[PDB]
Amino acid sequence: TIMGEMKNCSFNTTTEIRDKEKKEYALFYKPDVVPLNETSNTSE
Amino acid sequence: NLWVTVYYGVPVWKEAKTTLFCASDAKAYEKEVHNVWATHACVPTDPSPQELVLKNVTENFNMWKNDMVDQMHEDIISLWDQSLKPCVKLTPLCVTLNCSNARSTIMGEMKNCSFNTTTEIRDKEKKEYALFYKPDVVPLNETSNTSEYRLINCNTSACTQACPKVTFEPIPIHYCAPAGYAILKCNNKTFNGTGPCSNVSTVQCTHGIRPVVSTQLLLNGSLAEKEIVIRSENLTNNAKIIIVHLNTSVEIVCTRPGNNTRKSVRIGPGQTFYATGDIIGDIRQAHCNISEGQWNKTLHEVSKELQKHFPNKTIKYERSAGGDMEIATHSFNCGGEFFYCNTSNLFNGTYNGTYINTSSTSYITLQCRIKQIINMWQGVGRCMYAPPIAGNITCKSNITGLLLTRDRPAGGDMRDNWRSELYKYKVVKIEPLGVAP
Amino acid sequence: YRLINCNTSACTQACPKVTFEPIPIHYCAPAGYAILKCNNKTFNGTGPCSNVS
Amino acid sequence: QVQLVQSGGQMKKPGESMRISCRASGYEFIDCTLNWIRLAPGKRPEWMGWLKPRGGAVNYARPLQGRVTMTRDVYSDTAFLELRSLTVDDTAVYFCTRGKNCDYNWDFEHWGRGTPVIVSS
Amino acid sequence: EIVLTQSPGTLSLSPGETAIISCRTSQYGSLAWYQQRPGQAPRLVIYSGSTRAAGIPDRFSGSRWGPDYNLTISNLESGDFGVYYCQQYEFFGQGTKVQVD
Amino acid sequence: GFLGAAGSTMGAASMTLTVQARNLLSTVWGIKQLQARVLAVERYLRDQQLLGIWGCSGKLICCTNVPWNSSWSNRNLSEIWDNMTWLQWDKEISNYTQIIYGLLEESQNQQEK
Amino acid sequence: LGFLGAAGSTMGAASMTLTVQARNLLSGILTVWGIKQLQARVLAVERYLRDQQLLGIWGCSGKLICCTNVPWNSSWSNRNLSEIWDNMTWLQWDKEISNYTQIIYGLLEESQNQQEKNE
Amino acid sequence: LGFLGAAGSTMGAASMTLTVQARNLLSGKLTVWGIKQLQARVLAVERYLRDQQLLGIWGICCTNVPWNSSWSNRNLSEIWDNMTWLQWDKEISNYTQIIYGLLEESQNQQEKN
After folding, report:
1. Which residues are CB-neighbours of D46 under 8 A, at least 6 positions away?
2. Is D112 in CB contact (< 8 Å) with chain E?
3. Rounded to an integer, what is the distance from CA B192 to the centroid of its chain?
4. B238 in contact with E at a CB cutoff of 8 Å?
5. Alpha-carbon gap, residue F35 to B233, rounded angstroms
6. What's the CA gap between D37 and E42, in Å, rounded?
7. CA B318 distance to own-chain centroid
8. Element (H or E) spanning E34, and its range?
9. Which of D45, D39, D61, D28 is nearest to D112 (CA)?
10. Where in the sequence is the domain holding G40, given as residue range(s)?
11. Which residues are registered as beta bridge partners of E19?
12. C48 close to H (CB below 8 A)
């Protein structure tokens, strides 16, 4: 029906400088990702 | 009426192309003591003494259309790559560097740098106190303060260290025909780059050409036996390269003063970076000495040779055209460390007072510059790093050829620079059967 | 404490299925070559051998 | 498909810096030599620029010494033409070009969209 | 120094005619020819003095050995109107144009 | 020395055919020698094989049972014997090449009947 | 591929097609994956060399036929000339004699040595 | 291995069994380790091909090169009955290149025809 199949994901990543970090804004399909343990919140 | 037969051992030729293999001398593990370009797999010893002059052998040659030079270039680049394959990767170094100039014309060229690094324990950090050349460090975005720098490569690609014992000057290495093939050497001294050759000789294996590396000039080569020689694809096709082969060598010496010292820097378990630790001396930057006004004499001969081929457009000379730094400057790797020199003083002047005049006054000087990080083969992305070497480095060489365009020194191609040497030779195969009456 | 190696060099693990006792392994001459065996039990480390097989 | 894409033109005042970029779309930019020429109404058209993008070799015509410069970025696959000290005579269409084969470095095969240069005298 | 003098300067011809344009050199080299429609990118037409380039019909032809080279365009299609440029590797001339009669 | 025969006419070269045959036989980067060795050995094996297929091994020259035709060459005994350098005759017959190949198989088989 | 045409025919037809089979037997027409061709080339060359060598050990090179000097036993095949020549097809005869393979391999090195007692 | 039995015998018995030596002379992923078997086989094949090549250039064989007695004056009976092969091989090995040569000329004298 719609791309609810697609899951929006944001995460930290390193720059070319090995010590610096930046956030990201990425998209991935549901079967290519898994949630963590459900005792923690399922958003991760 | 005469009926069919088969010869065997017919001495005839077919202009075939194949994979040559070389022969080179060897004495130890790293191909004599240390290695970059040599390879003992190309067997010792020199099989060049097999030589013979041949009667009535008229044969065509074409150095521009030669192909085995391409195979030889492929061999050198593959060997150089696999030589650097096992060496250390300098990826950890790319962290922010708080930097300044030297502690106290002068090696203010040097940029003092301090930075964080990890110990052998993976989670423990320590500060450092290192020195680097200006062109090998990029400042960060100017919206931030310019005191912070980074390595140039990590915005584009990775880095690799040059192994210490893998360091070597060019060896004379002979290219030898396999069985069933033969090498034809033209012997006419007035060879025009391509065409028939009448004094052709043949050898089981060829001259030991050195894989020398230098931009805008040919050095440590083999002089011509006629006067200064000119070779070109087509002179009137102005925008193509012209090559000049000298009949007499000219001497150049390059040095930098100072008892400079390096220090190893432990970076993680099992590898060490080699940063320059200090510079000790007057250390006047990298000046090179040319053999007085023998250049002033030699340009006269080159001008006359060029003028012979063309109508009276007066010959003169000009600085490098520009472009990239390696094309802007003459380059070479004599001392292991790479050198670059602004060649403006070489090509200045136009008039007979210094182009039909000769004398011996004093060595001409070239301003030069030093670099470590380099994309070795003319910008191809083998981004690698060479470590420093102790002080009082010195070099000596003999200049043998020049590169020019037509209507300025050219940049050139290293494959072409070796092709300037391989013009003498050609590859062929045997066809041993035939018929008669 | 720390591991001994990392002050000097790296480390590697041994794979589980890569484990093996010494097998009797023979050594065969290629074509054109041959292997000569001395049978004299009093062989003095080097010298002539008479019962050569 | 090999194609040469040109950026927009410039309509700036005389006596100014002028800049053009051309990208060799769909091709190994590093290997083949590009060139720049001029085309204008009724003008004897002229050869401007050379660029062997591997080493960045360059040379210039007689009227263009000093004024005219270009450089290359292999990662962007883009040749950047830049003219100094613009004048009224510079008004012409500029083409980034190529030869029939990457064997001889001349320009009679490919042509961009002809980004124009106009001098607001 | 124009070492490629295209002649005649221009031709006014109705469709289907046979256009001829001469180009005179004075230096050894390769005489190719360009063509661009009004406001369009150029195209190679003739190469090496006589050989048609890729995608060029048999209408266009050329010659000869010597200093003078004669371009010819049989069966003039109106789309072939516009300017032409005699050319060889290091040389091209002033240019000439073909239009309706 | 066999290249010395190349720089001479047929008659002088006729006394030096054997030496050419004698010499004709004989860092993963260095492994490339194997291809050259294998290809040279294969060329030699093709030579010996095809000498077999004419029924003419051992002998360097053999009385093999096909005739000649003026179409393949009309030029006479004397020109080919004395004046003729090898590469020119090789080129001339090479204009025919495959047609002047072929038939000796069935002539080997003719003697093999 | 014509040599296989004789495989589909009786003995006489194959009698002339021996050479065409011999001709093709020698040779024919990141990615380090392809060097197994060298293994195949070496093995084919070795097989051909074995053929020529063995022909040498009969003292019967050059020819494909040679007048070899040894007895023959009907125990290996007692069947008459006509059946083995006219009606027969090669694979069946090869299978038949294959039962006696090493019973029809052995001596003739000694036969060569026998006529070499005076050569 | 029988040919080594002839090694332990004099000329006479070994003359009966030279062929077995010729018969045996010819042949007998992560682990790229063992690839050098290929070049070993190539070298063995090359040695065999050299043997056949030298046999070809000579044209047992009624050849025509003479034999200066300086290389060996020892009589007929010694080099039939008493002589073990290694000793006489070493004896002639002193004159190796002195006794390598003119078999090619022995081919050439009959190549005069």
Report:
1. D37, D38, D61, D63
2. yes
3. 24
4. yes
5. 34
6. 12
7. 23
8. strand E32-36
9. D39
10. 4-119
11. E73
12. no
Chains that touch E (3 or more CB pairs under 8 A): B, D
* Conformational region of residue C41, where left means phi above 0, alpha means psi within -120 to 50, and beta covers everything else: alpha
- CB distance B23 to F103 below 8 Å: no
Q: Which candidate, E39, H44, D64, H108, places its Cα nearest to that of B9?
A: H108
HSE-CB at B300 with a 13 A cutoff on CA atoms is: 13
Number of residues that this document lists for chain D:
121
- Say what the resolution is, in angstroms: 4.9
Asked if residue D107 lies in contact with residue D97, where contact means CB atoms within 8 angstroms, the answer is yes
Task: Answer whether B273's CB lies under 8 Å from B90's CB.
Answer: yes
Q: Cα–Cα distance between E85 and E94 in angstroms, integer? A: 7
Q: How many residues does chain E have?
A: 101
Q: How far is CA E2 from the centre of its chain?
A: 16
Experimental method: cryo-EM
C31 to chain H: nearest residue by CA?
Answer: H27
- Pick the residue from chain H with its C-alpha nearest to F39: H42
Dist CA G104 CA B165 (whole Å): 64
Q: Which two tokens stand for residue A44?
A: 């991760």
Element (H, E) at F45: helix F33-53
Q: Note every long-range contact of H106-110, with CB atoms under 8 Å and residues 24 or more positions apart, other chains counting.
A: H106/H58, H106/H59, H106/H63, H106/H64, H106/H65, H107/F18, H107/H57, H107/H58, H107/H59, H108/F15, H108/F18, H109/H64, H110/H59, H110/H64
Residue contact F21–H56, C-beta within 8 A? yes
H27 and G38 in contact by Cβ < 8 A? Answer: no
CA dist D78 and B155 (Å) reads 18
Task: List the single residue in E with minimal CA-CA distance to D99.
Answer: E89
CA distance H52 to chain C (A): 15
Give the count of domains, chain F: 1
Which residue in the set C28, C31, C34 is minimally distant from H26, CB to CB? C31
Q: Which amino acid is at D30?
A: I
Task: Say whether B96 and A16 touch across the interface (CB within 8 A).
Answer: no
Q: Give SS3 for D97.
A: strand
Chains in contact with F, counting 3 or more C-beta pairs less than 8 Å apart as contact:
B, G, H
Tell me how far apart the alpha carbons of residues D68 and E85 are, in angstroms, rounded to a whole number.
Answer: 25
Chain H touching partners, 3 or more CB pairs below 8 A? C, F, G
Q: Does F43 touch chain G (CB under 8 A)?
A: no
Output the domain CATH number for residue D74. 2.60.40.10
Q: Does H36 touch chain F (CB under 8 A)?
A: no
